[PDB]
Amino acid sequence: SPHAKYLRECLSLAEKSPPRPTNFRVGAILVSRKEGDYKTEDDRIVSTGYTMELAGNTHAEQCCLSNYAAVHSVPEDRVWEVLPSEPDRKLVMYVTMEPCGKRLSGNLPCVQRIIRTRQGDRKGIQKIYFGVKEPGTSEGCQMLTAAGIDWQVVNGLEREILEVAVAGHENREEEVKAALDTL
Ligand SMILES: Nc1nc(=O)c(N)c(NC[C@H](O)[C@H](O)[C@H](O)COP(=O)(O)O)[nH]1
Ligand SMILES: [Zn+2]
């Protein structure tokens, strides 16, 4: 699976995140892919990010978009203006964890940062590949569906993604076990 390989590279990015009690260590990779029977060799990496890579309370997907925006001299909320939008290619994002539909901090959730890349004549991010649903007791995937963003869960990496994600948590072992039980 090309998707599993991408998610393992997202995991390596997630491992750069500093452990904190209030969030998850996640990694994200933005890819430009040819429409149709694509060859993975023709994939182009557009950006990458990981949790708290950039100053402030930042998520992996947020840093991925903000890294691109910074190179292009716009704030991240304007990254839709400068992302590629080529007729024969689509933007897809790999993320270890399901993008968030709500943040306890009140920051704009990652599903909304993804949705707003589709503005004006720009195609934006068309599909999300992720490895685990967000752990815990309105789901991000449902918000993506409602806005017309495709997504696909890539199975097989759940334990490794979760153990990295919750390394900064006191309840990490129970948290991982609970999340695997939802499979
Ligand atoms: N996909 C994803 N990538 C991340 O980089 C990250 N940190 C989360 N975590 C989602 C979780 O719901 C939020 O971490 C809490 O809601 C606390 O909110 P803040 O992070 O402090 O804004 N999820
Ligand atoms: Zn998020």
Resolution (A): 1.6
Q: List binding-site positions for Zn(2+).
A: 59, 61, 100, 110
Class of domain 2-182: alpha beta
Nearest CA residue ID for atom 17, ligand 1: 104
Q: Which of 49, 53, 48, 57 is nearest to 18 (CA)?
A: 53
What's the 155 CA to ligand 1 centre distance in angstroms?
21
Name the E strands within the chain: 27-34, 44-50, 89-97, 125-132, 150-153
- Residues near ligand 1 with C-beta < 6 Å? 22-24, 26, 51, 57, 59-60, 95, 97, 99-100, 103-105, 107, 110
The structure's method of determination equals X-ray
Contacts of 15 (CB under 8 A, 6+ apart): 25, 27, 164
Contact 96, 10 (CB under 8 A): yes
Domain parsing of the chain, residue ranges: 2-182
Residue 104: how many other CB atoms lie within 10 Å: 8
How many of the other CB atoms lie within 10 Å of CB of 35? Answer: 11
Compute the distance between CA of residue 172 and CA of residue 152 in angstroms, rounded to an integer. 26
